[model samples]
Target: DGTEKWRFKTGKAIEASPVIGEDGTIYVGSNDGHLYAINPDGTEKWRFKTGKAIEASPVIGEDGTIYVGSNDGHLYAINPDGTEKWRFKTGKAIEASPVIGEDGTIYVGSNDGHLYAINPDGTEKWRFKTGKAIEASPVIGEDGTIYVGSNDGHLYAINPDGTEKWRFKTGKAIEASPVIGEDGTIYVGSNDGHLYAINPDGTEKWRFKTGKAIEASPVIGEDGTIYVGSNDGHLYAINPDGTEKWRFKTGKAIEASPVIGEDGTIYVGSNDGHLYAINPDGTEKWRFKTGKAIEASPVIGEDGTIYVGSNDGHLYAINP
Candidate 1:
């Protein structure tokens, strides 16, 4: 239970995970309408202002360009020095995170019901209209195909050319991002309370049902086990055969994505509480009690450090 390394105070509750740059600078966002660049030692480097709350996590491109979305209906690119590089204005708020392709193309979704492909300089490459808002992040496959889910109840496979490859419809809206396995299985969850394992050809290989809804993305383990959390307070580990291997209880609804630290997991939950670290074998190895709820996922640093934010207006760096 010795995961607390330090705490950095922000303007408001932080619902975004901290991402460490190659220089060890920690970048994260808060409901305070600011993106913070904090030193590795927990000092402030700078802060970038936005127009609204930022729930989406930031992703860095090959050129050290940071991309993140805000409820302000804009996708921003910030320089490493916290200066504005450029911004692409969407028609509505953006809660979905961005993904960069091998060609340096940036793909992001907006609450305005559009998935946009923008160039490095912030020029529009293409836009794909979905049936509803997109809150899930996009994942690029080995073939360069972009896979993303939509509140539109459809999982879209988009080619690099911005053309549709295929789409698979689910029972309900898809707020969960799609996770691709080593064999290219597209795994995603729906508000309908089912984990769908889909093939690349837009067909269902299998689907595992849960007792409640799952907004958490699938975390594929080193051994090929897929782990996902549900609104029912249970973290499920499923076999490649689509069978249940084990279940870990967190005692609250998990909207925060699970990251593997052991036999695999930190997550956000209901009510004010502790930050939990779980084992791959279905056990709680370490937990540091917090006074607020966490909605962001825990990001593991390259050196095995973990960082996350709480709804209590603090960003915590957890060290074992």
Candidate 2:
């Protein structure tokens, strides 16, 4: 049957979700220190090697340039032809994914405790320093405000000029990427075992406690519901007003960010080696077993195919 399309094997662990291009070419990074591009039919297209493991997901630019970071302390810009366009050397390992700004500027955080904005030419535009390593991706607000978290136990707001706007101290380190709501509210999780809703003005609107640390990024539903997973073995659904809607227990710790399908089905993976689909009404739809733990986030394609990577060294496409 067409229930399952195909699978590709990687020689090492995968910690980043695969990004599909318009031409159906899938790109992903592996802990083996390689960035791979696979054809639609599950065939290898090309691969680029790094000095160290790459845990950040690849971001494609309008000009077809692929951007990614590595523990090798470098940010790479690769061309569509699989050649190096340019590379920016950072002070430390770059574990956070790069986010492209409206001006095609590249923004990413590094374990060296710095957030950098680089130009298209691979030259540094500006940089800001934080107190700790940043493992979370930055989210740009509609007004061009940049929001990101640091393991230093603070959420920072930086202006487009790389100047500090403000910062709010939290109970513990933050490893979760921030999600912006339609109303301009920023939501993120912290290792302090709490989810925070921050206003546009850099002030806290509310905070909800989770049973354990949260490393998963939060996803917003079409109906304004917030979904995130935690090491506490639970997936929570919170209303837009910061109230708990429901919590579903998983078999083990969940670090993979949840992805919501167009039909409102939520899909996420856990260290228990299982990927789950939850209905819109907060019930289990189905679950799939994998050979190892899944720490990469899931990305749903237009065709309803779910793409995720696992520590088992495989990239899978499962039909919901």
Candidate 3:
């Protein structure tokens, strides 16, 4: 059942993921150089223009301020009403999404090979340098450690005080963000065609091999299963013990990450231009086709509505 509730057109592709606000607004960034605020009913609320294309997703602050990065090398803080609060310039373009720390600090990485920690006021707190550009978003550990991946094939763990905790190297660049499991294991995908599970102490626990690069981040299931997509066009379900549970094949590469519904349905998009809903046991629930590829991840709404963007320049809301 390809039931689409609504569809909104944009100027270009959307590689950035959508985030829901406290009041049920859907915020998404587009390569068209604008941040769109769409209502829950699939109507446009407002659009904020940026200097350049935006590949990074927007993260909402506690106060409803939206933080997103652009190819123009700036991180913008926009008000809930779509007004500009302030903008902080980075050294180079930023493709990585921003993550807000508990203390309201925004951590975002720039293609300039530096991760900048900015205050809520759009002022810089500190910047940590990496050997190569960082396109992966930073995830904060419970202990205030910021873990991010760089194009240099290394995952750097930086303390809140801007000090390096440790770095883990992979065989290739890491474009996928890391996910922290319940047991403090960091699950990250790399262009090396492998997903490495690292311990809290920065040691490797296990590694799972894929057929190709995995730019999509892993999402943990209720029973500790890790669901991730690969450029090989398969969405793999791996056990916590680093074994393959199952794999659902798509028609093309999968760059979009999977989103889990309350019913354990894994919704993921692929370069094949279809949004697939997979059952918990690795079966297809349903699929909705789009005009072009979908690099953006699906975000489930409060009422079981799924919102996703595509390279066809449209944001679609499908019924659950």
Instruction: Report the number of the highest-TM-score candidate.
Output: 3
lDDT by residue for model 3 over 1-320, one digit each (tens)? 45899998889998888999989999999999999999988789999999899998999999999999999999999999899999999989999999999999999999999999999988899999999999999999998999999999999999999999999999999999999999889999999999899999999999999999999989999999999999999999999999999999999999988999988999999999999999999999999999999998899998899999999999999998
TM-score of each: 0.96, 0.98, 0.99
Order of candidates by TM-score, top first?
3, 2, 1
- Write candidate 1's Cα lDDT for 38-100 as tens digits: 998888999999999998889998889899899998899999989999999999988878989
Which run of 10 residues does model 1 get worst, by summed lDDT? 263-272
Ordered from best to worst lDDT, the candidate numbers read 3, 2, 1
lDDT (CA) per prediction: 0.85, 0.90, 0.94
Evaluated with lDDT, which candidate comes out highest? 3
Task: Give per-candidate clash totals.
Answer: 3, 0, 0
- Score candidate 2 by TM-score against the native: 0.98
Distance (Å) between predicted and true CA of 174, model 2?
A: 0.8
* lDDT assessment of candidate 1: 0.85
lDDT of 2 by residue, 1-320 (tens): 11457778887889888888777788999999899998877889999999999998999999889999999999999997799999999989988899989998899999999999999999999998999899988888887878889999998999999999999888999999899999999998999999999988889999999999999999999999999999999889999988999888999999989999888999999999888999888899988888899999988877788888999998888887
